[PDB]
Scaffold this active site. Sequence first.
Site, PDB file in Angstrom:
ATOM      1  N   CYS A   1       3.271   1.772   9.837  1.00  0.00           N
ATOM      2  CA  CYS A   1       3.341   0.858   8.665  1.00  0.00           C
ATOM      3  C   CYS A   1       4.796   0.759   8.204  1.00  0.00           C
ATOM      4  O   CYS A   1       5.496   1.797   8.114  1.00  0.00           O
ATOM      5  CB  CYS A   1       2.334   1.199   7.569  1.00  0.00           C
ATOM      6  SG  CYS A   1       0.654   0.739   8.108  1.00  0.00           S
TER       7      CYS A   1
ATOM      8  N   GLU B   1       0.944  -8.397   0.735  1.00  0.00           N
ATOM      9  CA  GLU B   1       1.144  -7.011   1.245  1.00  0.00           C
ATOM     10  C   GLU B   1       2.623  -6.649   1.433  1.00  0.00           C
ATOM     11  O   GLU B   1       2.901  -5.558   2.019  1.00  0.00           O
ATOM     12  CB  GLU B   1       0.294  -6.807   2.505  1.00  0.00           C
ATOM     13  CG  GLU B   1       0.124  -5.323   2.859  1.00  0.00           C
ATOM     14  CD  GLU B   1      -0.562  -4.464   1.801  1.00  0.00           C
ATOM     15  OE1 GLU B   1      -1.234  -5.051   0.887  1.00  0.00           O
ATOM     16  OE2 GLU B   1      -0.373  -3.198   1.845  1.00  0.00           O
TER      17      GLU B   1
ATOM     18  N   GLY C   1       1.322   5.767  11.063  1.00  0.00           N
ATOM     19  CA  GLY C   1       2.732   6.126  11.314  1.00  0.00           C
ATOM     20  C   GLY C   1       3.623   4.898  11.492  1.00  0.00           C
ATOM     21  O   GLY C   1       4.840   5.048  11.251  1.00  0.00           O
TER      22      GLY C   1
ATOM     23  N   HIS D   1       0.815  -1.241   0.000  1.00  0.00           N
ATOM     24  CA  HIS D   1       0.000   0.000   0.000  1.00  0.00           C
ATOM     25  C   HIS D   1       0.849   1.293   0.000  1.00  0.00           C
ATOM     26  O   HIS D   1       0.263   2.392  -0.187  1.00  0.00           O
ATOM     27  CB  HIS D   1      -1.033  -0.044   1.119  1.00  0.00           C
ATOM     28  CG  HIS D   1      -0.489   0.104   2.502  1.00  0.00           C
ATOM     29  ND1 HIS D   1      -0.406  -0.990   3.368  1.00  0.00           N
ATOM     30  CD2 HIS D   1      -0.121   1.200   3.214  1.00  0.00           C
ATOM     31  CE1 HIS D   1       0.051  -0.563   4.537  1.00  0.00           C
ATOM     32  NE2 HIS D   1       0.259   0.769   4.455  1.00  0.00           N
TER      33      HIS D   1
END
Length: 182
Positions: A148, A72, A146, A41
């Site tokens: 990730c 991911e 904050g 992402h």
Amino acid sequence: MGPGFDFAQAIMKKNTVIARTEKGEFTMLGVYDRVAVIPTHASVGEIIYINDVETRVLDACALRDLTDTNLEITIVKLDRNQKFRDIRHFLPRCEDDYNDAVLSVHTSKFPNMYIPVGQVTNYGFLNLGGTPTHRILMYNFPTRAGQCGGVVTTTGKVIGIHVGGNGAQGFAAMLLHSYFTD
């Protein structure tokens, strides 16, 4: 404070950079040579900022399992003039549960941040932001925006990168040795 935080600090001080994309600032784990990982992402493009220096992306691959399900994890090869310490021997070979993990973050917002997250469950499937995702680790800490890209370690092992939460639990994508064979 103790040997968990010791191993986490040793990874942060040599194997992380601050990565900036058009989607924000991320903790980015460097694994070996010029190869690093970041949450998918983050939407890595042709150029990325690495510790505020404009950096060409030589390759970016959004990993999926052999069911064609999102993991991911994006693997990024950076056009950087310096190699990372090789930490691939600290990666697990198989999916597993863990005790007593630390989540470590280093950004402009959260510098030198370490969180004892406790027991880590092999959760498996998660609908992450509406996207079916596999190989998810879960910890019972109320993690925030904050965080990730933050690194999840035990003593001796680098086990995942933080990819989301639901306000009560946090979720990491597993790192496996098999992602980084060359």
